Design a binder for these strands. Structure first.
Lengths: 58, 84, 125
RNA sequence: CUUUACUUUGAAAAAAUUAGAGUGUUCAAAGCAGGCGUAUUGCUCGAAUAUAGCAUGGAAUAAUAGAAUAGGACUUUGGUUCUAUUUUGUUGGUUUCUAGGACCAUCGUAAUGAUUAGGGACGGUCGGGGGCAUCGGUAUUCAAUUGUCGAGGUGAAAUUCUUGGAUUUAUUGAAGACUAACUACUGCGAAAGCAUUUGCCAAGGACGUUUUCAUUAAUCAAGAACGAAAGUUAGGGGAUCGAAGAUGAUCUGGUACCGUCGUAGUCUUAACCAUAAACUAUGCCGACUAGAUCGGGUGGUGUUUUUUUAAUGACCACUCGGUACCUUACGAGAAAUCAAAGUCGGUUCUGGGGGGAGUAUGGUCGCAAGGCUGAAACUUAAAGGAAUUGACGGAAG
């Protein structure tokens, strides 16, 4: 929200039009966090390999 | 008084050769000796002496920068201490 | 590291030290000293243990007049060796230039036999 | 041409030993090489492409969807259906193989050869490195008061100061500056620079067993910050000595030296200008080559100090850093001399005869004095360094 205030100070608007038309760009940044979270699948594969090692050596 | 600073930034303990500790040292004490330069402005050697230790912060900014900054460790240092 | 190198062994021959006491070890030291052995400029050599890096041993026999480095490692060609050999060696017939050729580090006249170019390290005469 | 070899695993009491497997892939052509006419396989030659695995991705295996290719069964010949193979997307068990991310140990030996190269943490330690706030002592000056009658200067003198009581001697009070001795052939600070004592904030170097990140480093035009003294601006302060200024003396002259007074300065805060024959006249950083002193750490099974015995010592052995420095061989140089200013690299600055000239002019900075950058016409035939002899001195013996 306060990215719109940092789009007033460092002005990319002019008047009442461009103001509300921003809100889309800032919201799109949150999608990058979901892509980064997919890396946790490698840790799950390592846990399965550890279980297989414990099943082998017993 | 150094020992209370050590146990904050490091992975383990005792490793100020883990270099973000010098970055945090010089920044935090350079503003403290500048209390003694908010004291008077005549001041010969402590203004000279300040140049040495405050410019060493820029050689410490040259430090981890050149070798390896894949996730930039340099930008963690300057965020925590507040540098450049 | 290059600068000091050939000056130490040269000053040893100047005074007349029978063995010279030199040290380092990693992987640009010893086989042109086997070219020096073949040419009869030095004698035998061996290795002694250290804590870190290594220790060499070199036996001398009072041969070296001046050896020294070529500090910028210039390009030598299979024609223009002897533009350098003119100034490097004040004597011709005596001495040789050590080239870092493409076929390892060897002699300069041996390099013309292989027909191989490269860089340079130093002179011995 | 050529293996002994190398390695992950099993069977062995251990182990000798032994058994099995491996040591790149793909495509086109040409040559040689097993069995055959060939095909085809292996190797070599030449290219392309990539160079620890188990989150992830590929193949094998299974399922499903799309596309391509081949064969069979059919066809109211369009197509449908079944099977095999390849490719692409997606999902799951198992087998095998490939990318990527964080963190840490050691420095082994073969290619320039006696190498711990950068940052500190931990624990002790030295110093006039800095700024501020206090405090103490001596000497000088001024003000007041007592006892006592002329002084001060100089080569001689006088201006000058004194009977309206000076110099002075003591007491009392005040104002400013500086810190004798200790004080050094000393220590600190990168340089400028830094002297009573005490307290607070706060910086850097060196040593010691180590612990520890792992080229992170070196150097650096521009650029940024700092700046002895003198000078400038605004507000304070002025004890001790004084550029300018005013008298006396000296001399041929004396706008000086000397003597009597005295203004700006000298001190302080803030701001500015920024220079010095700013010096080691010697750039910084790293490795090779005989010989003091100050600080740290260790040793002296012997001796001394000495009654909280801490002697920190005495005096001697070393081992490291700074290294007032002294003195000197090799070696270098024109030589005096140096002891690297011998000699070497990586990098940066700077020189190309004297005078004209650090000037002229422009740009740029400054409040202003002035700084920084920066020539030519023309003149001339030399300027200059190292070293010698002799005369002379209001030089010495």
């Amino acid at each position: 929200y306060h990215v719109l205030y940092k789009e007033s100070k460092g002005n990319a608007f002019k008047h009442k039009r461009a103001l509300v038309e921003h809100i889309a760009a800032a919201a799109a940044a949150a999608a990058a966090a979901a892509a980064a979270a997919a890396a946790a699948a490698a840790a799950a594969a390592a846990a399965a390999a550890a279980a297989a090692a414990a099943a082998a050596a017993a | 008084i150094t020992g209370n600073k050590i146990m904050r930034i490091l992975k383990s303990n005792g490793l100020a050769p883990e270099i973000p500790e010098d970055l945090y040292y010089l920044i935090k004490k350079a503003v403290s000796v500048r209390k003694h330069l908010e004291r008077n402005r005549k001041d010969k050697d402590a203004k000279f002496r300040l140049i040495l230790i405050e410019s060493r912060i820029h050689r410490l900014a040259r430090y981890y920068r050149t070798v390896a900054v894949l996730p930039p460790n340099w930008k963690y240092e300057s965020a925590t201490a507040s540098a450049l | 590291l290059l600068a000091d190198a050939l000056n130490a062994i040269n000053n040893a021959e100047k005074t007349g030290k029978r063995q010279v006491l030199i040290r380092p070890s990693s992987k640009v030291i010893i086989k042109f000293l086997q070219v020096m052995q073949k040419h009869g400029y030095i004698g035998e050599f061996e290795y002694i243990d250290d804590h870190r890096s290594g220790k060499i041993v070199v036996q001398l026999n009072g041969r070296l007049n001046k050896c020294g480095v070529i500090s910028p490692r210039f390009n030598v060609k299979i024609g223009d060796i002897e533009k350098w050999t003119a100034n490097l060696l004040p004597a011709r017939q005596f001495g040789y230039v050590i080239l870092t050729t493409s076929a390892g580090i060897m002699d300069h006249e041996e390099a013309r036999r292989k027909h191989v170019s490269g860089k340079i390290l130093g002179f011995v005469y």
